[PDB]
């Protein structure tokens with residue numbers, strides 16, 4: 586068949602996980618989507634001439650850490666680690682998400698992409714240079730996105746898939 590990849594979108598409440606994922610699937614910006622609704626979505630994509638089926642989990646639920654998520658997270662093949670460029674706390678939380686991913690996957694080498702969302706807003710408080718410095722330190726790609734304009738959205742998901750395909754060849 587065509588290969589199938591499980592992708593997981595993680596990050597703090599309100600960063601735009603749902604807006605991103607719905608943009609990629611439904612081709613429109615859905616604002617104020619309920620913060621607690623979780624869903625999976627499927628999408629066929631062609632990347633570098635190979636067609637793949639993406640199964641994308643948009644994480645939600647209660648606004649705390651819960652180990653009830655972790656069996657689900659262990660099924661992820663690649664993760665988008667999303668913060669909002671107008672929200673310093675959401676950037677500060679990225680460390681915790683990467684540590685939990687490494688813990689559940691029991692690996693130092695899990696496909697991941699750092700996503701700085703809401704790039705359309707003028708209210709940036711997270712310096713692109715500091716987020717780039719963090720991504721360099723982790724050894725993972727960094728893409729600034731806007732779910733609203735769609736800037737960066739496809740490149741974030743496609744770069745993740747590329748990282749997964751490379752991982753699977755090691």
Ligand SMILES: *CCC(=O)N1C[C@@H]2C(=O)N(C)c3cnc4c(F)c(-c5c(O)cccc5F)c(Cl)cc4c3N2C[C@H]1C
Nearest residue numbers: 595596597598620644645647648649650654658685686
């Ligand atoms: C508005 C809800 C929302 O977007 N949330 C819910 C919660 C949340 O708010 N916090 C603080 C939270 C904390 N820690 C989380 C995780 F550690 C993980 C995670 C594992 O448990 C294991 C492996 C990878 C992980 F990323 C997840 Cl999936 C979610 C956590 C949350 N949520 C963030 C977000 C979905």
Ligand SMILES: Nc1nc2c(ncn2[C@@H]2O[C@H](COP(=O)(O)OP(=O)(O)O)[C@@H](O)[C@H]2O)c(=O)[nH]1
Nearest residue numbers: 598599600601602603604616617703731732733
């Ligand atoms: N301007 C702007 N607002 C966004 C963007 N992404 C999400 N939002 C808004 O930020 C809020 C949270 O988005 P949501 O998708 O619910 O975040 P989630 O909790 O991470 O799933 C909503 O009010 C969205 O309309 C973005 O790229 N630009």
Ligand SMILES: [Mg+2]
Nearest residue numbers: 602603620645
């Ligand atoms: Mg959401």
